[PDB]
């Protein structure tokens, strides 16, 4: 059944249901500061996507996991499961995409997705920048197995832009490091190799665009590139933070700016 498969959490009540969604390297948990300012008001749906650490390895799939759109159907089964519909989805990275995708198919379950630090594609080509370059990652996707542990460490501050002492990463970390190692590469893998545009026009529900001012895995434009690209309505709110996981190391400056955009719609 979808809704243990998922750590499927509901609190709160209300007409409106808040679904939130964790991105790569966490858990429903990230969202432990953002809970207690919507409680009084929504109704909230928590889950862990599967291949989060706290989901069972038994389950994890590495034929439907290796693209996005396995993550969005398990999306749309989990609202059906718990009848939600019409749905404020809140989703970090490619949580926000998965939901964008699902919205695309399924568009009577979500009123408006807020998107947190995200971005359609990583890798550069000629006419679009990413931020990563495909020969580069060729080589780090070669010995990814062997140097998890090692290249997730090394990186992790940047990515935070916190320090590696620092609460923050520790407790990045705690998750990250929670998935069975197999599964982390494979879901690793799926993202450096996503490229969602071709769906973006086909897009319509209305979108809030999130970001850091200075993210490694997301370059400021792209929020712009999102606007004009998605075929509905959005908002673009770049937010004085740095890193890739505001919500988890900015949460003063990002709880508020979260909020508003839960709470205030930008279409009638």
Do not use: K, W
């Given at each position: 059944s979808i809704g243990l498969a998922h750590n499927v959490t509901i609190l709160g009540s209300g007409e409106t249901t808040v679904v939130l969604g964790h991105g790569y390297?966490?858990?429903?948990?990230?969202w432990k500061l953002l809970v207690p300012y919507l409680v009084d008001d929504y109704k909230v749906l928590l889950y862990d996507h599967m291949?989060?650490?706290?989901?069972?390895?038994?389950?994890?799939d590495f034929d439907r996991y290796s693209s996005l759109e396995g993550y969005s159907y398990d999306l749309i089964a989990i609202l059906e499961e718990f009848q939600v519909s019409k749905c404020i989805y809140v989703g970090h990275s490619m949580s926000s995409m998965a939901a964008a995708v699902a919205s695309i198919f399924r568009?009577?379950?979500?009123?408006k997705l807020v998107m947190?630090?995200?971005?359609?594609?990583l890798i550069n080509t000629e006419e679009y920048?990413?931020?990563?370059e495909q020969k580069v990652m060729d080589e780090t996707l070669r010995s990814l197995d062997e140097n998890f542990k090692s290249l997730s460490l090394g990186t992790a501050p940047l990515l935070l832009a916190c320090?590696?002492?620092?609460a923050a990463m520790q407790e990045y970390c705690r998750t990250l490091f929670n998935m069975r190692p197999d599964i982390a590469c494979c879901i690793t893998r799926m993202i450096c190799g996503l490229d969602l545009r071709p769906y973006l026009g086909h897009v319509t529900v209305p979108c809030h665009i999130i970001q850091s001012s200075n993210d490694i895995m997301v370059p400021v434009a792209v929020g712009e590139y999102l606007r004009k690209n998605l075929g509905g309505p959005s908002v673009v709110e770049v937010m004085p933070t740095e890193g890739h996981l505001p919500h988890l190391s900015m949460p003063e400056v990002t709880i508020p700016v979260v909020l508003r955009h839960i709470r205030q719609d930008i279409t009638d």
């Open positions: 390297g966490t858990d429903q948990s990230v291949g989060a650490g706290t989901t069972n390895p038994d389950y994890f568009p009577d379950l979500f009123h947190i630090s995200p971005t359609p594609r920048y990413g931020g990563f320090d590696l002492e620092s």
